């Protein structure tokens, strides 16, 4: 009623989304897991940038905008970041301070932005890395000596993987004054995510639809989940013992789960019996965020 936990995964597709750097002419990718295998990741700030872009897509006032200007990476920063900014600053982001001007910017607001209502974590490839690469290009020169680029015609490399990966996220429901107008935009945005990559000119990859398992409990930030699916994606084996004893045997109750796209699996018998406990009905994940966002929110 006051908390919301969920994890989101994706469809399989070849994905490069290069992030690293190397003079060795191979655009390395980030690996963090250590079980004798390498897994690709996507850092959360890229997803935060995509969320900001999508909040820009819908009508939502903002104080931070990315400008295309001189080679130094720069941001047009516009007005003072005030906590009463309709979309971006209030939802997340922080107000930095070096001098903090005089008398605390005329005794206004607070330069300590502690809360980031959207809590995000990195993704894990859940598929071992393969040393395959692609010999996709050779740089070539100019012949008419107009706006002449690098002198020679170089060669380099790139590597790709066929992978699908998931990430967890969470947020705590405390405010109801300004959040209901803006929170609905966040949930709609999460259903649709577009970007989160280096260059979509090649290997444009989108991870919008797949099974989802949102959970809202008045447990003060507590999760029985593990934040991980199988290679096939049937993580629900752990709940098999949990669902059977909803009524008795001193185990969690019937209103204890939510469904997603995975419900459309071939078998149907236990889905009929699982319907008696949870809201396992939404075949389309986009429809799920339309309803359970209402229940979690005030209306």
């Amino acid at each position: 009623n006051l908390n919301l936990f969920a994890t989101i995964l994706t469809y399989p597709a070849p994905a490069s989304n290069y992030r690293g750097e190397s003079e060795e002419n191979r655009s390395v990718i980030q690996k963090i897991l250590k079980d004798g295998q390498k897994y690709a990741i996507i850092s959360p700030e890229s997803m935060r940038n995509a969320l900001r872009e999508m909040l820009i897509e819908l009508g939502q006032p903002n104080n931070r905008t990315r400008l295309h200007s001189e080679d130094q990476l720069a941001v047009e920063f516009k007005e003072y970041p005030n906590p009463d900014k309709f979309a971006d600053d209030f939802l997340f982001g922080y107000m930095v301070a070096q001098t903090n001007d005089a008398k605390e910017m005329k005794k206004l607001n607070r330069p300590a932005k502690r809360d980031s209502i959207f809590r995000c974590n990195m993704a894990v490839a859940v598929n071992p890395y393969k040393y395959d690469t692609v010999f996709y290009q050779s740089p070539l020169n100019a012949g008419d000596s107009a706006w002449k680029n690098s002198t020679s015609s170089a060669l380099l490399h790139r590597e790709v993987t066929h992978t699908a990966f998931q990430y967890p996220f969470a947020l705590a429901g405390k405010d109801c004054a300004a959040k209901p107008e803006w929170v609905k935009a966040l949930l709609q945005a999460i259903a649709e995510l577009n970007g989160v990559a280096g260059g979509h000119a090649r290997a444009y990859y989108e991870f919008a639809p797949r099974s989802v398992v949102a959970r809202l409990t008045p447990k003060l930030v507590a999760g029985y989940q593990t934040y991980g699916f199988d290679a096939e994606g049937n993580w629900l084996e752990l709940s098999r013992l949990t669902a059977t004893d909803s009524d008795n045997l001193d185990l969690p109750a019937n209103e204890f789960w939510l469904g997603g796209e995975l419900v459309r699996k071939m078998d149907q018998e236990q889905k009929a019996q699982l319907e008696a406990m949870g809201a396992h009905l939404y075949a389309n994940p986009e429809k799920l965020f339309a309803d359970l966002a209402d229940s979690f929110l005030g209306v």
Binding site: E24, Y131, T133, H157
Partner: protein, 111 residues
């Protein structure tokens, strides 16, 4: 292995010299008195060693490095210790890759 390190250096330099001698019928024995021959000799050595170095450095992996090394390189002649050196190689190869990179890159002519 230090003995196998010397083997790696020797086979690398031998491969370079033999491939240069076979491909462009050129012998260092004619060095004296023909400095222009020295220019094209160094040019050919540059070409072959640069190609080999880029090819070996291009990718790193167990199977790729192993089969490229055994196919495109001709090891020296020794009677028995090849079994010991190979079997020691097959558990760990990264150090062997670094050592052969060192041996091959040491072949660049000066200036």
């Amino acid at each position: 292995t230090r003995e196998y390190a010397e083997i790696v250096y020797k086979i690398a330099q031998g491969f370079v010299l033999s491939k240069l001698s076979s491909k462009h019928d050129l012998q260092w024995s004619k060095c004296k008195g023909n400095p222009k021959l020295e220019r094209e000799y160094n040019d050919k050595k540059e070409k072959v060693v640069n190609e080999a170095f880029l090819a070996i450095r291009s990718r790193t992996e167990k199977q790729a490095f192993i089969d490229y090394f055994v196919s495109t390189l001709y090891p020296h002649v020794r009677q028995d210790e090849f079994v010991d050196f190979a079997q020691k190689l097959f558990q760990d190869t990264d150090e062997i890759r670094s050592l052969t990179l060192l041996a091959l890159s040491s072949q660049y002519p000066i200036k």
